[PDB]
Amino acid sequence: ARSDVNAITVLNGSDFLTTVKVRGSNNLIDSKSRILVKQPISASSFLGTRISGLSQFWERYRWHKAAVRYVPAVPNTLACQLIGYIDTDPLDDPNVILDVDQLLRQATSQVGARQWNFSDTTTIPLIVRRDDQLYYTGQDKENVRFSQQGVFYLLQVTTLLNISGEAITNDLISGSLYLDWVCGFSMPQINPS
Amino acid sequence: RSARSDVNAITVLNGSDFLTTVKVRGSNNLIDSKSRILVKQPISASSFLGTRISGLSQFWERYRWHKAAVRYVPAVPNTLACQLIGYIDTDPLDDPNVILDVDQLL
Amino acid sequence: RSARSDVNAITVLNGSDFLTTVKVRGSNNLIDSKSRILVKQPISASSFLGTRI
Amino acid sequence: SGLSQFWERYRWHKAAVRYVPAVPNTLACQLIGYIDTDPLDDPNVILDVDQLL
């Protein structure tokens, strides 16, 4: 019962991340405004979820099979495109980019990218590196390439408009993001909070 | 002597990319024949900056699109309506902007 | 849906390149242990600007 | 349920709730549905909506 053995505990689950909010007309004036979501895919980044509550009780993690999911809360009459991709290198910050087309293109260039209208649903797969490197579970520290295994950027390609042609300006909510994940934790512990 | 090779070999490679968004002009900003030209995007490999095909272009001297095909990915429902014409002119110097007769342009 | 692929494939490619010239320091400019370090050239692929690798 | 009174014990060897909508695709609202196996687990006591979800 007092075993000093370490082993990966690969356990599965699902979680609710947050509700997206298409930026609309007013709040959309430049490129960086078109970045709705910048959410690290570190296990311990989603506070109340089960994944993070578990992560708090280990040192390390590694997404063996993760996939962000979009579930719309709108009709099919509204119109706006969305692009989503998970950059496996956190320190790649597109916010510095001004040219919007350059932004969408460096997004599409990432392999796991996805484009979808905010009236249907699609899945954003996380692509896993090939070296077996484990990542630390605690809050982000001096460097990020240790903790974060990826970063989910959600983009607004077009402008938001309604049944009629008038474009909305009220910055409404379109859907919700879920995470159907499979992770492997290595070292039992407790992280400070 | 350290003689670099002398084989001028061709490297053919394929893949899709992304030019830009199309912005229809509406009734306000459509007051002329030039306003009806929404996209003027050269097809030189070195014209697509953010892409990596253009970057590779700098690693060679000459190019030739053995096959190219622009694809339109819409974002609207079937409720809205507007006709569009798209043609890849093989002569860049042919400028439609100089035209005034909209029908001639079309 | 326009879903870009999900295949993280490896692309191995080979070729030679050119780092820089070596400048021996002579008797005048060799007055210390640091002066005897002629080349400090990182080997990160992104360190060779002019090259295409 | 009526038959249930004719026996003492039961066990759902298989159950599956099915949602039969009545609206078009014009309206939109997200829904979550989960069969909790512990009846005493009451979500009403919660205040943090995100925790509930």
Binding site: - | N14, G15, V73 | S2, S5, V7 | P21, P24
Partner: peptide, 21 residues
């Protein structure tokens, strides 16, 4: 030659009204 450089795929989906049962 380098195959599958930037391959993109498209799969159109309809969006009717009043899915009936």
């Amino acid at each position: 030659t380098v195959p599958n450089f930037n391959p993109i795929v498209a799969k159109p989906t309809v969006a009717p009204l009043q899915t009936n049962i």
